[PDB]
Amino acid sequence: NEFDKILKIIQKDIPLVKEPFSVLAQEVGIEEGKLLKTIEKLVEDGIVRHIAPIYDSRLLGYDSALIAFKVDRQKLEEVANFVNACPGVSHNYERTHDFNLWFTLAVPPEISELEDVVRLMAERERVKDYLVLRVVRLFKVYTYTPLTEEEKRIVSITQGSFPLVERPFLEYAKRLRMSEEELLEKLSALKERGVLRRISAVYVANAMSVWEVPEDAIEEVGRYIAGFKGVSHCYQRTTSEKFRYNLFAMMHGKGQEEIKLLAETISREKALSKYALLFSTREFKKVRIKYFSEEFERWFKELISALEH
């Protein structure tokens, strides 16, 4: 099926050439214009909603962490809306835990350390207890070189929707005042460095399950948990005094108790008595950040300025 072949192929990394859809068209076996208009349908209708470059957050120089605030209900909403205002906050959730507000914060390089940003946030919101957790996705060598201002501009203008045209790098190249060949050259290098991952198209109850697992077992455990329906993303971090859980596993079900059952099973079969179910009871924000926009810094100055008194 064409639909099946096209849907399948645009989820694969799209080649860094001048006419990538010409190449995909050849591989699929259909005329390019027909391939193009079809892609639109798939995004117009929403089984794939977008098609874009995927950049590695830390290889861009972004420090990102999972932040948890201890806020009490009277002030939960007020604090939540403050968090959402931050351009570096991607997801924000109210969860069932002593730390009842969890958000993902990403901070651009050369503005402020992440720890400083959250300190000023917590100080402004009068939040005494907070957590700064750096997790790594369990999808189961790259060295961070600071990006030049040109590479920042490249990432800045390319990060959005990939143009569904014959020459999807052309307009970008014109804006960057360079040839397509020069742009693709730089995009290739970023891909070689892992800064650019790829260019591709991509329940009722939900919970972040957190687990304390011996690190010589987190691999196996992570894979065991990954085999279950109701389990999506898994993350790992180090253990700490402030938060002894080193394995994170996003759970979902058509009910809380259903998730509880799944967690209890895992706890049983893997002998993991140390865990907690942090159910998502509110979603304040679920956007994806734009990299290297000026709006974080401007937001940041305001936080500084508002703290002046």
UniProtKB/Swiss-Prot annotation:
Pfam families: AsnC_trans_reg2, NirdL-like_HTH. InterPro entries: AsnC_trans_reg2 (IPR040523), HTH-Siroheme_Decarb (IPR050684), NirdL-like_HTH (IPR053953), Tscrpt_reg_AsnC-like (IPR019888), WH-like_DNA-bd_sf (IPR036388). The gene is nirDL. Involved in heme d1 biosynthesis. Catalyzes the decarboxylation of siroheme into didecarboxysiroheme. Siroheme is probably decarboxylated to monodecarboxysiroheme, which is in turn decarboxylated to didecarboxysiroheme. Disulfide bonds: none annotated. This is Siroheme decarboxylase. It comes from Hydrogenobacter thermophilus (strain DSM 6534 / IAM 12695 / TK-6). Changing H91Q: Almost loss of activity. Does not alter binding of the substrate analog Fe-URO III. The keyword Ubl conjugation does not apply.
